[PDB]
């Protein structure tokens, strides 16, 4: 598969929004994880978001906290993702994004998740003390370090973090953002306008939408991917049976890919 950035790229210069799906490795297992990351990619993801659980992932709405707690009962490790990768990797056609809150990695070298078909990283809680030396560090490893950006880093620190990043800048929020008559709120789009007015670089949005109209509006705001998470990990990890949280997670997704095109 290609890096991250590349296949950003394309999809901008074609006019069209990547489609990335975000799910946990290891919900509710990671034999499921493997087989829900090939059905992924046969529905036509452009890129695919996968979680390391740890034990406070502070950062992640609800769904996805109940989510990594469901990975860490299920004993998953960065070791047993990293084996699992190994093997998956070679068989999906498009890149995966390994996302990693920073005490489980502040020990690691990289060299392993290059090893294992990972193209870039996520570090939600990427301390400003370390944030150089894990970019340095990436960058002698061949990984892209994908940085967030949020609504309430002022102006001119997003601008020093479109630069430094690499494969597409993030834009997220830790704050819901589709009010009571589930409208989308009329703010998300200047927030995404704000980001796109200081960078070519392609501007990722993971607001937490799930709905194909809403998903449609945001790519329509200018956004380049939309990140679906929570919406992706209710199919498969709230579902009755590993069997039937993938049958959910094909549906689901073929109609987001379809809401996407």
């Not at 193209?119 to 002698?140: C, F, M, Q, R, T």
Request: charged residues 20%; aromatic residues 4%.
């Amino acid at each position: 598969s290609r890096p991250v950035s590349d296949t950003m790229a394309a999809l901008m210069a074609k006019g069209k929004t990547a489609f990335i799906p975000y799910i946990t490795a290891g919900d509710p297992d990671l034999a499921t994880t493997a087989e829900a990351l090939r059905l992924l990619d046969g529905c036509g993801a452009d890129v695919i978001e996968l979680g390391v659980p740890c034990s406070d992932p502070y950062i992640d709405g609800p769904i996805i906290q109940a989510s990594v707690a469901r990975a860490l009962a299920s004993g998953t490790t960065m070791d047993a993702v990293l084996e699992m990768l190994r093997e998956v990797t070679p068989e999906l056609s498009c890149p995966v994004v390994l996302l990693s809150y920073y005490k489980p990695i502040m020990f690691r070298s990289l060299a392993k998740m290059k090893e294992a078909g990972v193209h870039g990283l996520i570090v939600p809680d990427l301390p400003y003390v370390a944030a150089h030396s894990l970019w340095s560090e990436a960058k002698n490893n061949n990984l892209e370090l994908v940085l967030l950006t949020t609504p309430a880093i002022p102006e001119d620190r997003m601008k020093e973090i479109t630069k430094a990043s690499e494969g597409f800048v993030y834009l997220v929020s830790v704050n819901g953002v589709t009010g009571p008559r589930a409208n989308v709120n009329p703010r998300v789009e200047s927030l995404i306008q704000e980001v796109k007015k200081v960078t070519n670089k392609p501007v990722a949005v993971g607001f937490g939408i799930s709905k194909p109209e809403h998903v449609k509006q945001i790519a329509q705001w200018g956004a380049d991917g939309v990140i679906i998470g929570s919406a992706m990990v209710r199919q498969l990890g709230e579902a009755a049976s590993p069997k039937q949280g993938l049958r959910r997670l094909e549906e689901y997704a073929r109609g987001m890919k379809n809401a996407l095109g």
